[PDB]
Amino acid sequence: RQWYSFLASSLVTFGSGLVVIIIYRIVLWLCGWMTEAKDWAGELISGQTTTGRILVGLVFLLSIASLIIYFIDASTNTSVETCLPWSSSTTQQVDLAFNVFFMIYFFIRFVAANDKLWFWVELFSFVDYFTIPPSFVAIYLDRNWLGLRFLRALRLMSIPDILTYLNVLKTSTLIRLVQLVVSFVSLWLTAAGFLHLLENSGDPFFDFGNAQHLTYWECLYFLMVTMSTVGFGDIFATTVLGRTFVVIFIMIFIGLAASFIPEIAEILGKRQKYGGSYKKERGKRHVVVCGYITFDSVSNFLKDFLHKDREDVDVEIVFLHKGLPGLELEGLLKRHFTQVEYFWGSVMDANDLERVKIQEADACLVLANKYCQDPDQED
Amino acid sequence: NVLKTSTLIRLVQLVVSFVSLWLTAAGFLHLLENSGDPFFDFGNAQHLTYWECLYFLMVTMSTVGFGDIFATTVLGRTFVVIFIMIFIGLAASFIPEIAEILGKRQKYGGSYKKERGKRHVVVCGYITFDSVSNFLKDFLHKDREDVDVEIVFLHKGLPGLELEGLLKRHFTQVEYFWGSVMDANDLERVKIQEADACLVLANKYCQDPDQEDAANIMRVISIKNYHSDIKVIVQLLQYHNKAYLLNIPSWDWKRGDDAVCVAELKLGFIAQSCLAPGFSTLMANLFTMRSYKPTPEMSQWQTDYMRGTGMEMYTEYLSSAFNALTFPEAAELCFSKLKLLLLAIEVRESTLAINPGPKVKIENATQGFFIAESAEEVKRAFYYCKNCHANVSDVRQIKKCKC
Ligand SMILES: [Ca+2]
């Protein structure tokens, strides 16, 4: 019966503030509470100042704390709605303590985003519009509803902002990945919450009689087997709204087959295989070999350098080259791995010269591409 | 003729030819299952809704195939087998190609909004993470005066991830817009008439310096063509091209326009170093903002050098206490009491005098040129109230006196 009281509280919050913004714009169009506040809120929400930095990291951490309470709510009980006396459960109190802090942070933003129609419609404002009012209805009404509280899982997309404002993610590929991962974990968790709501509520067209009691975890599973286009149908949608949402969701997540899983596999595969350093034993000598390194040049070199007719000296050979070895060269290096090493790098870089311990090296050999396009450039 | 753009007609053609065919096939499958098969006197039949057929066709087009709904007439089935062979073929174009077209939009469209109190400068030409970071690091440096100028980038390309990160870190006083100073609409987007100055940066590592100069001369032409009175500061990679600019009918050196020529300056500095070895490293350090940062793990000579690199050139009005001093005793007074080195003065028409002799005396509101660790240091030469207040040796004490 009573559920619409929660959702209506969200809608009147959105609508009343929107109408206030419109009549304010219209009154101006007929016709420190100054730009200092806009700038002050700006830096805060941007981590210029240390206090801004603390506040923004703490908004991010409390967003996770509220999301975890939604997982505890979705894991426990059975129904999407129950008439719990408001004071009784500790989890419901401490979620309200996070909820008021998000409401405070909102206004702050409002100030930085300068009391504007476009701001009042930005995604994270809706996340709040739909979370803050229902938790306040739950103070007045001795009842609990899971009621779109999953939307907090969108605020987890602050991670790339937090890690770039605090500036720990240095590399372009690392920011990209983390942006891909977090924008995939959000949306996946978010859609599982929305499907869980639609199936467990049942359809309004059928007086909520047509309903299906999924857990949130079964919705996560169901969305992964449909995102991957496997589709076992052991779990499947049965409300008409649910179904719909699945039809819409498929059209979105076939579109998100551009980037995501293939592009993260690309970036995560582009790492450097032959990083790291040589370790010099006291007894062994070594020589560093660089310049033109290839399977034919290395095999012609090794075949003479380690030949059986040569004296029984125990020199290790350390290759240093600015590229990944080919399969046949990795095979050759594997066959000689007892006295041969290869490292990615260049003798043009003093860090790579330290990696190969060039000071302790007995000699350094520079090989040439005898079949180059211009002998003078190779020299 | 409402759909102007080639990409818009293409998309709308893709969308509508996907909504048709999908709706159409749902109707045909709905007919075949709900009629039943004619081979079996219509006894073999399955009562789907049209909406269940739409759903069933979407989960088979996407190749998900739950099989919660599935075809059971032999005609239905057939039609599903044919339909799969069609809609695997329509995986060429459709969903990936509409996602491409819908993704090709412009991220950094739109316009700057000018507040009355704030100044801004427009920056264009060679814009990249390294050039922008080298520019921002000096332009917003802590040792610089507490001016509140906003920086508006205008460039004909999408910023790289590291540049979007840099722009995000400075978003309180930095903006970026897609466009070119060759287009009068983009000059309006950035409100160039209200801009305090425009800076044109150069690709110093280009394939041909003369083509990079030709491109920058155009820009300067295009900016001045839009509004004459904009102060334009332009980077040139060859002196032989500077002339061209001098002819543009509105380059007015007296107004502020300037052309930093990296050739003229480079070779110049090096020349001075022939007459006084080392100078070029004196001056180059003097014209870049840098705070001193002592550390462990650094030699005595490096700490002395580093302290020196901390100093930069600044300019400030001399206080009333300097009135009628000769320049040499004013400079002595700055070094001894203020802990500032005074090189030169603006002499009132306007001219600049370097180390002028005893013949020259400080007039009221004379602007001096100083070497100091920061703008906060040089303000002592403005607040200094003579023997009325300033008689205590911790220079830090100097602050704005009562009269
Ligand atoms: Ca300094």
Numbering used by the authors:
A (entry chain A): 14 to 44, 79 to 426
B (entry chain B): 214 to 561, 567 to 621
What does the literature reporting this entry say, word for word?
The large-conductance calcium- and voltage-activated K+ channel (BK) plays a fundamental role in establishing negative feedback loops to control the firing patterns of neurons, transmitter release, insulin secretion, and smooth muscle contraction. BK channels comprise four identical α subunits (Slo1)2,3 with seven transmembrane segments (TMD) and a large C-terminal cytosolic domain (CTD). A voltage sensing domain (VSD, segments S0–S4) and a pore-gate domain (segments S5–S6) reside in the membrane. Additionally, two homologous regulators of the conductance of K+ domains (RCK) in each subunit (RCK1 and RCK2) assemble as a tetrameric gating ring (4× CTD) and serve as the cytoplasmic Ca2+ sensor.
